[PDB]
Amino acid sequence: GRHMRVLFASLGTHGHTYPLLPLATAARAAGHEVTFATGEGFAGTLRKLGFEPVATGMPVFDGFLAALRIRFDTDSPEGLTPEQLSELPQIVFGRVIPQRVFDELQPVIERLRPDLVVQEISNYGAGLAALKAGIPTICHGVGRDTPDDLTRSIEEEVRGLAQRLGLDLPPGRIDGFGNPFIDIFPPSLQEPEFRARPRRHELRPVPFAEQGDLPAWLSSRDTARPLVYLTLGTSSGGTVEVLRAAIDGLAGLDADVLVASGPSLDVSGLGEVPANVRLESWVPQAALLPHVDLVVHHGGSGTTLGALGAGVPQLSFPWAGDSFANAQAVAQAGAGDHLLPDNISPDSVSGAAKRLLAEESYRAGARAVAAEIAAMPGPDEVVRLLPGFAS
Ligand SMILES: Cc1cn([C@H]2C[C@H](O)[C@@H](COP(=O)(O)OP(=O)(O)O)O2)c(=O)[nH]c1=O
Ligand SMILES: [Cl-]
Ligand SMILES: [Cl-]
Ligand SMILES: [Cl-]
Ligand SMILES: [Cl-]
Ligand SMILES: [Cl-]
């Protein structure tokens, strides 16, 4: 089991791709040849890590357009109730993307002959492609198990797809296609049923280490003041309305506020902001978090786990994806708090943030999880299992 060809495959967003990079880096360091399938935009990052990049997936727009046609036989959302529209994500993620990824990986697997596939949990198409070609596979988590309505709906679409592809799946949860599962969620905060799953292996949720520079103003800021970091992710985890509300609620505090708006959020008409607020487009989050006193965010898994890993209290605005499951876990740990979508006002943000900074129990809760995260097996230890997985 030396010099294996290992194919990693994730959905093409930062949140779905970054969590797999540490295991992939450890794999290469162990002497394996890493091919990494995800969005085309990650090619540069992947090459820098010494991986061979493969481009999979499609633009967000094309995904929802296909879902719209499939479900409602129309090209336009207009005239559709928000309830009807809420029927689309399960089709986008359980049917349309997996079909595309399954098809794209056919040629790749054929020519590469990988010894092992590492499939990111939400990238169902890659698991089907590996099943089809009979390649040993393991499933790599990105966050907490989420036994919620949306995931069950997505999984129903996946089973439907597998059946159409002539691939037999058991009834019931997809469960990583029954493969060994690499779980990066702090065990105490993981769903109890998932935590007891056979063939589950812990892996420390290492944040993505990028050699980028931190903003210069940080080096001369008055560190007697708290530093607050506000972000809404990279995948439409929030609206400009939410952002402005958060900025105005946080700007009041006696604190410095670093805002990272992300690539897919245009705030071009955001308005002027107080002097203690510094707007960045993108930052090396991993490198930043250890210097921060409060993380305010939409509740994405990467940022949730980064704040927990750094022992920093967090305030989230859970809205989409697994954000409610994260809020729940953070609440459980006493490591932060959240505001529901109806209760996001400068006043509500201000009060919550003041509380999270003043009450020492939140930092305590967060630091407890940081300790649990540090004791989890590191990529170099976990990577030693790959040969076994490929047998
Ligand atoms: C917006 C932003 C994100 N990121 C990174 C941090 C996370 O690993 C990832 C965001 O993932 P995550 O926090 O899971 O949110 P979502 O998936 O809902 O977008 O992007 C930055 O490094 N800098 C930034 O400015
Ligand atoms: Cl290739
Ligand atoms: Cl060979
Ligand atoms: Cl096993
Ligand atoms: Cl560095
Ligand atoms: Cl998803």
Transcribe 342-381 into DSSP letters: GG--HHHHHHHHHHHHH-HHHHHHHHHHHHHHHHSPPHHH
Give per-residue burial for 177-205: e unless 16+ CB within 10 Å, then b. bbbbbbbbbbeebbbeebeeeeebebbbb
- Say yes or no: domain 1-206+374-391 is CATH 3.30.1150.10: no
Closest CA to 273 of 297, 244, 300, 295: 244
- Residue in this structure with the two tokens 């979508």, named with its chain if needed: 341
HSE (side-chain half, CA atoms, 13 Å) at 385? 19
DSSP one-letter string for 289-321: GGG-SEEEES--HHHHHHHHHHT--EEE---ST
- Rounded to whole angstroms, the Cα distance separating 379 from 374 reads 12
- Paired with 119 in beta bridges are 9, 139
Gap from CA of 91 to ligand 6 centroid (Å): 11
Burial class of residue 137 (count of CB atoms within 10 Å of its CB; 0-12, 13-18, 19+) = buried
Resolution of the entry in angstroms: 2.1
Domain range list for the chain: 1-206+374-391, 207-373
Residue matched to tokens 């993380």: 295
**Mutate which of 13, 14, 45 for ligand 1 pocket (most atoms within 8 A of beta carbon):** 14
What are the backbone dihedrals phi and psi of residue 324, each rounded to the nearest 5 degrees, phi first? -70, -40
Q: Is residue 159 within 8 Å of 174, Cβ to Cβ?
A: yes
Radius of gyration (C-alpha) of the chain in whole angstroms = 21
3-state SS, residue 226: coil
- Rounded-to-integer distance, Cα 88 and Cα 281, Å: 30
153 labelled binding-site residue:
no
Burial bucket for residue 387 (CB in 10 Å: 0-12, 13-18, 19+): middle
Please tell me whether residue 212 adopts helix, strand or coil conformation.
coil
Residue 376 has, within 13 A of its CA and on its CB side, a CA count of: 22
State the closest ligand 1 atom to the C-alpha of 298, by its place in the atom list counted from 1: 18
Q: Which of 185, 188, 222 is nearest to 202 (CA)?
A: 185
From the CB of residue 94, how many other CB atoms can be counted at a distance below 10 Å? 27
* 58, two tokens: 């499609």
- Please state, in angstroms and as integers, the Cα–Cα distance from residue 37 to each residue in 9, 20, 60, 62, 390, following that order: 4, 11, 17, 19, 19
Tell me how far apart the alpha carbons of residues 190 and 141 are, in angstroms, rounded to a whole number: 12
Among 204, 229, 230, 181, CA closest to 369:
204
Q: How far apart are CA 222 and CA 17, in angstroms?
A: 35
Ligand 1 binding pocket, CB closer than 6 Å = 13-15, 18, 208, 231, 233-235, 237, 260, 262, 282-283, 285, 300-303
- Distance from residue 384's CA to the centre of ligand 4 (Å): 12
C-beta of residue 235 within 8 angstroms of C-beta of residue 297: no
Secondary structure element (H or E) that encloses residue 33, with its range: strand 33-38
CATH superfamily, domain 207-373, is: Glycogen Phosphorylase B; (3.40.50.2000)
Kindly give the residue spans of alpha helices, DSSP state H, lying in the chain: 14-17, 21-29, 43-48, 60-72, 82-85, 89-91, 97-112, 124-133, 149-164, 192-195, 240-251, 285-288, 301-310, 323-333, 346-358, 360-375, 379-382, 386-390
The environment of the single-atom ion ligand 5, i.e. residues with CB closer than 5 A, is: 211
Q: Up-side HSE of residue 122: CA atoms within 13 Å toward CB? A: 29
- Calculate helix-pair angle for 323-333, 301-310, nearest 10 degrees: 20
| 283 labelled binding-site residue | yes
**Ordered alpha helix ranges (H), 202-283:** 240-251
Cβ-based burial of 31 (10 A; exposed 0-12, middle 13-18, buried ≥19): exposed
Measured from the Cβ of residue 318, the count of other Cβ atoms closer than 10 Å reads 23
Is the sign of the CA dihedral 87, 235, 183, 384 positive or negative? Answer: positive
Determine whether the annotation assigns residue 235 to a binding site.
Answer: yes
Neighbours of 375 (CB within 10 A): 11
Distance CA 262, CA 78 (A): 28
Whether 266 contacts 291, CB under 8 Å: no
In this chain, the answer to whether the domains covering 1-206+374-391 and 207-373 adopt an identical fold is yes
The neighbour count for residue 62, using CB atoms within 10 Å, is 14
Distance 287 CA to ligand 1 centre (A): 13
Q: How far is CA 48 from CA 15, 226, 300, in A?
A: 19, 34, 25
- Is 151 known to sit in a ligand binding site? no
* Ligand 1 atom closest to Cα of residue 297: 13
Q: Residue 57: in which H helix or E strand, if any?
A: none
Substitution site in 285, 297, 298 for ligand 1 pocket (most atoms within 8 Å of beta carbon):
285
